Structures are given as structure tokens and as C-alpha cells.
């Protein structure tokens, strides 16, 4: 019945344009035209990884029948304590280059060789604070030896990791900060989320002063929490047979968090 699909929209993930996302896309384009490496910093629930996904999608690969593809933007999330062979394996896999085995020195040479001719312009690294300290040398090498901009993405832990090596601090000195929601921006967001994401059989009227009090204490400005609290309350309302989010179950959900 109709009730079964509705978990899926709620559970299903989506991207909503927001001021913070637009700000990055334009700044990254300055960096990509200029071929300047830089870093993006901010708290872990500000939605940094998602903004970078949205950016990647705007520049599709071009592929002919025979020769290899043009791919302007590369995005990678390293694993914890990611070493040199692991970094080169991820750059190589995001392009689906078929060769899979090799010595660390062979992957190094092979990675430089697939970034060239393939025409990469920007390399984005997410949770870059996971990089094992010696792998920043292979990143400094990619950045100086090829006309490729490198964009490190992380939390305030990224900085503490950068400040331990003058060689790295200086190539990556410029940066942009992802901030939290507040005031009218938090209010307008909430409203967008109701019209663009929840779409329930009857409005939940979230901008009301009494509901914004409950959301603000529950979420403390993180877009992450706001999305999770709202969807959880919506599904949990629909499964109880209500046609909207009930203030009573919004209060119940906000009690767990």
C-alpha cells in the first residue's frame, strides 16, 4: 500500500541546496581555475562530505570509444592510518584503471602516469586527518609535480596534524570554514526541509515558535541532527497513523538525543 513507499522517501537520502554548499562550490572553482591547493575545515556534522559529493556530480567524465577519459575532479576518503600504497590504490580505483597489483614504487609511478593524460584538475581528500604522517610527502609531490590542485577536507584535528610539519603547512595555508546553523538561517532551513524533504499528507507547521524551541534545543545548529530528528519523527508519526509530525512524538524523539 501507499504506506510502504513512504518509509523509503524518508529513509532515502537527498541533497538540498543550501547557502553553505553554494559558497564552497564557487570558492573551489576559484581554486580549480587558479590551480591552488587549499584546505576545508569545520565540525564533523556540518555536511562537508555531502557538499563535496554535490560538487563532483556537476562535472561528469567524457569517454570516447577508444582512448582513456577526461575526469576534472577526484574525490577520496582515506581509511584510518592510510599509507602510501593505500593512497595510490584509491586514486587509481576512483578512475577504474584495471591494473590492481604492485610494489609501492610501482603504484607511485603508475598514479602520476594516470593523473597525466587523464587531465585531472582537482584532488579532494575527505577526513584528510586520517593520512599516515609520511603520506603527506606523496601529496606534496602530486601537487608540485603536476598542475593539480589538492583540497584537504577535515575537522579541527586536521589543523593540529598540519602544524606538526612546516613543509605541509605552507603548501596548504589557505582555507575555508564550514559553520553551523543559527537565527533566521536555521529557521529558513527548517522551512525548506518541510517543503522540500518531508512532504507529509498534512503540514507539520515547523516554523512555529513553539516547534522551533524544541528543534533548537534538540539540534544545536547541526544540519546532521536536524535531518535525523525530522525524518525519525516523520516515519515514527506515519507508522503510528498520524498524517503529520506530532509535537508529542517530536518531543519523544528529541528525548533520546
Amino acid at each position: 500500500e501507499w504506506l510502504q513507499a513512504e518509509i523509503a522517501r524518508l529513509k532515502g537520502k537527498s541533497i538540498v541546496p543550501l547557502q553553505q554548499v553554494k559558497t564552497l562550490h564557487d570558492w573551489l572553482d576559484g581554486k580549480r581555475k587558479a590551480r591552488k591547493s587549499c584546505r576545508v575545515v569545520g565540525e564533523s556534522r556540518t555536511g562537508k562530505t555531502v557538499a563535496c559529493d554535490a560538487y563532483r556530480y556537476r562535472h561528469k567524465p567524457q569517454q570516447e570509444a577508444g582512448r582513456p577519459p577526461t575526469v576534472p575532479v577526484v574525490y577520496i576518503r582515506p581509511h584510518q592510518k592510510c599509507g602510501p600504497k593505500d593512497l595510490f590504490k584509491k586514486i587509481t580505483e576512483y578512475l577504474k584503471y584495471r591494473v590492481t597489483k604492485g610494489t609501492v614504487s610501482d603504484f607511485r609511478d603508475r598514479t602520476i602516469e594516470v593523473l597525466k593524460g587523464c587531465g585531472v584538475e582537482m584532488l579532494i581528500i575527505d577526513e584528510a586527518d586520517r593520512l599516515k604522517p609520511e603520506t603527506f610527502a606523496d601529496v606534496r609531490d602530486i601537487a608540485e609535480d603536476l598542475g593539480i590542485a589538492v583540497v584537504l577536507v577535515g575537522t579541527d584535528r586536521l589543523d593540529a596534524v598540519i602544524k606538526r610539519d612546516e613543509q605541509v603547512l605552507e603548501r596548504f595555508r589557505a582555507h575555508l570554514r564550514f559553520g553551523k546553523l543559527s537565527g533566521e538561517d536555521f529557521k529558513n532551513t527548517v522551512e525548506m526541509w518541510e517543503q522540500m524533504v518531508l512532504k507529509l499528507p498534512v503540514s507539520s507547521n515547523l516554523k512555529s515558535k513553539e516547534m522551533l524551541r524544541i528543534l533548537t534545543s534538540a539540534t544545536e545548529g547541526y544540519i546532521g541532527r536536524l535531518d535525523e530528528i525530522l525524518r525519525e519523527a516523520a516515519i515514527r508519526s506515519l507508522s503510528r497513523g498520524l498524517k503529520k509530525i506530532d509535537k508529542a512524538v517530536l518531543q519523544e524523539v528529541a528525548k533520546e538525543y
Partner: protein, 164 residues
Amino acid sequence: EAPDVKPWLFLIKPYEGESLSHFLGRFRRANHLSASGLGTLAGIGAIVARWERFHFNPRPSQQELEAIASVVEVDAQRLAQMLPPAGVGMQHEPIRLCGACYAESPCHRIEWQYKSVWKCDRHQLKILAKCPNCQAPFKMPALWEDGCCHRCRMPFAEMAKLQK
């Protein structure tokens, strides 16, 4: 994950008559592979390091050429044209060169290793078996990266002037 790319390699097109040693050598410079790395990717193991030396003592089987065909995107029947035809005896000690034709197509032709070939017919010139100036013997055709003598650094195209 990738945004809708097809799995790929730096493929290369074979020339009109190059030897399997030379072709594999180009393939593993277009992609940066070692000889045992290419053999491992093909799943035939250390076999490739014989073929680059022309050590065809046990000859390349149909199943081994098909394994290489799955890497290099050339079918087993076009790979077989880079080896001697059935009963055409080759020699794998003196690597040999026309050099006059190397300006028309930079490759080691398989026919220069046949025991029956002594002159290139396109140019009616005696085939070389050493560098005409320093007398050095040529490297195996997989290693023809520079297209010149490894000792005196004379281009193979200039050995056109010094032969017959």
C-alpha cells in the same frame, strides 16, 4: 565511487609487423608495468620474461596468447602474427635491425629474426646485427625505449646511412 567510467588501460595499436617482444615492451611503457607484473596481470606468471628475450623453446600456446589478449585488447589471431609462422625457424641470439625503415615505422619487425632473411626487401639493404659505429650488440626488442644505440647513443634512423 566513480561517476560512470568504463574500466581501462593505456591500450596501444600494434604496428604492421612488429615482434611480440617489442609489442609487449611498448604495452608495459604505455602502462608502467614490470615484465613479471604484466605476466601476473595476464595470469600466466613468469612466462612474459621469456617472450621478451625470444626464449620460445616451448612455443606460446593458444591459451597463453588468449590470456595476453584479455589484457592488451588484441585477439589471439593478431597476436600470432607477431610470432614466426609454423616451421619458419627464427634465431633469438643476435637481435637485428633494418634502421632505414625504422624512420618509416619505429618498431622491431619479427622478420629480421628469421634464419632465411639477410637483406630488407623494401630498401634492398643488408640487415644489421650490431651498432655500425661502436660494434655494440642491440638490446632485446622489449627494451627499445630510446630507439638508438645504448652505448654510443646513435639513433636507429641514422644507421640507415652506415649499412650495406
